[PDB]
Amino acid sequence: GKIEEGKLVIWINGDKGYNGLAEVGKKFEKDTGIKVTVEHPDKLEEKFPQVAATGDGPDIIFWAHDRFGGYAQSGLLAEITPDKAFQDKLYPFTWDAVRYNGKLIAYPIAVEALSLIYNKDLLPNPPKTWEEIPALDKELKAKGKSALMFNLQEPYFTWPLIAADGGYAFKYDIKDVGVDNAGAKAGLTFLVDLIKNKHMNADTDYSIAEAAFNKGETAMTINGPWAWSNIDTSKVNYGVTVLPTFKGQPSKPFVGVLSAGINAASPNKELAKEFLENYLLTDEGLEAVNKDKPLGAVALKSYEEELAKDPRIAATMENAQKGEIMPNIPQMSAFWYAVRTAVINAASGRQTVDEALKDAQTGSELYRQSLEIISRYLREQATGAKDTKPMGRSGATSRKALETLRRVGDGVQRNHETAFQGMLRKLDIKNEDDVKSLSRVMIHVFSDGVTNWGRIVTLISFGAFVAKHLKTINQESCIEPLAESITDVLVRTKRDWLVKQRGWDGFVEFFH
């Protein structure tokens, strides 16, 4: 073991009410004598997978639900089994946000959506459209002010505009990605044109936009409920309202459900359950957090009935209903990373909107595309017959890549039979547990050195060799897990190289 028994360590983002959470933890300690430590480390959503994979990390992690599926896919989250009485206290759709493969993998805390925050002393009537913001910025520049400033370094904040005219992440399946259609292009182009016409600055981040709004220098910002507290201390006469439309269409923020997941490696799962169910998700626990930094529309019905009277919460829910609940599928991280880079590169001029979004599309589709190819190859190699299913969207790439792989990988498997048999014997794979064990070994062997298509063909060809072995020892059910694991090792460790090669299209070109 590694996580200490007898206490609770919690991770929550630095923009949330961690002091109020610590107050709840101090009440928990007063009752039980169990010390609760709340930390807010930088990049905790990226740090948690790494440290939890090795059995460390916090007992409880707080984040929006979109990441948790990935954590659940990697075995890092304990299953949540609250009884009906407690489940009935929270809104069903918040439970739906934290369900993964039919299992509850977190407690939902609160519903978050971005709104347009505006300075009533500068803008008694905020703009209803994105399109009128350039003229409004000219009017405000005439008097020493600016129209709008918001964080351009995180794609969460730009996504409402990208999605307004038809951009989307995953259609409601990981095969259909819409970050590079005409609507996404139109939204990102509007943002880039705002920057080129000096209505916004490409370097603007969270701190810069927050400081400019709370000092009264800019008339609008885009942000979530957690920010209201600081504005309250600013004494700016502010309102919270619906996001402007773009091309006559509502802005569509990605809706997050702040949720608390229990580390699968924690020896304090019953303590964490008691704390979350009977201390935090109460009227007084949620209030203690909310008084620090507002949570949004909390999942607890009794408290949300009080919070819903707040016009700021009504606007939050109006924008949420115009938006969409985030998926929790494990590729969300990759998606976000891709879009993050796109927005930044588009805003700085390092790429055009077309180039940036094409790269984002490649990055977002990489997992499913690689998985389709590798799975089909491994299954047809192990059984001697091919999958009859249609290739689907971007199916030309998958078909062509599978043909290329058939050629090159049967060459590799013929030539490298001795080393392959040796490593297969040295690994000794017998069941589903050893295949789940294979991933750290795979990362080690696939590590350092050069990255080329031939090494990837070697990875996949040895995967096919192992799939053949699994078929022989009557373990066909292990082939699809194996394939998945291989995919995860490939797309994660070689993400940037793969995107630079245009992905499997570059694979196909290289061996043409």
Ligand SMILES: COc1cc2c3c(cc(C(=O)O)n3CCCOCc3nn(C)cc3-c3c(Cl)ccc4c(CCCOc5cc(C)c(Cl)c(C)c5)c5n(c34)[C@H](C)CN2C5=O)c1OC
């Ligand atoms: C140190 O840096 C490296 C290492 C490697 C390189 C290159 C460049 C190329 C290339 O140009 O093709 N290769 C592949 C050469 C194939 O060598 C055959 C070879 N011999 N022995 C003595 C053992 C091997 C050997 C074997 Cl049996 C099987 C797979 C590999 C791989 C793929 C990564 C790991 O996969 C998987 C691993 C596991 C546990 C599982 Cl369950 C699955 C499902 C997949 C590599 N290997 C392999 C050798 C070490 C070279 N290797 C590799 O990645 C490189 O850069 C300078």
Ligand SMILES: OC[C@H]1O[C@H](O[C@H]2[C@H](O)[C@@H](O)[C@@H](O)O[C@@H]2CO)[C@H](O)[C@@H](O)[C@@H]1O
């Ligand atoms: O920008 C990508 C980022 O978006 C969302 O993160 C939000 C988070 O949900 C909010 O609670 C608040 O903290 O702002 C974050 C943006 O900086 C996704 O939840 C996250 O996974 C993703 O990386």
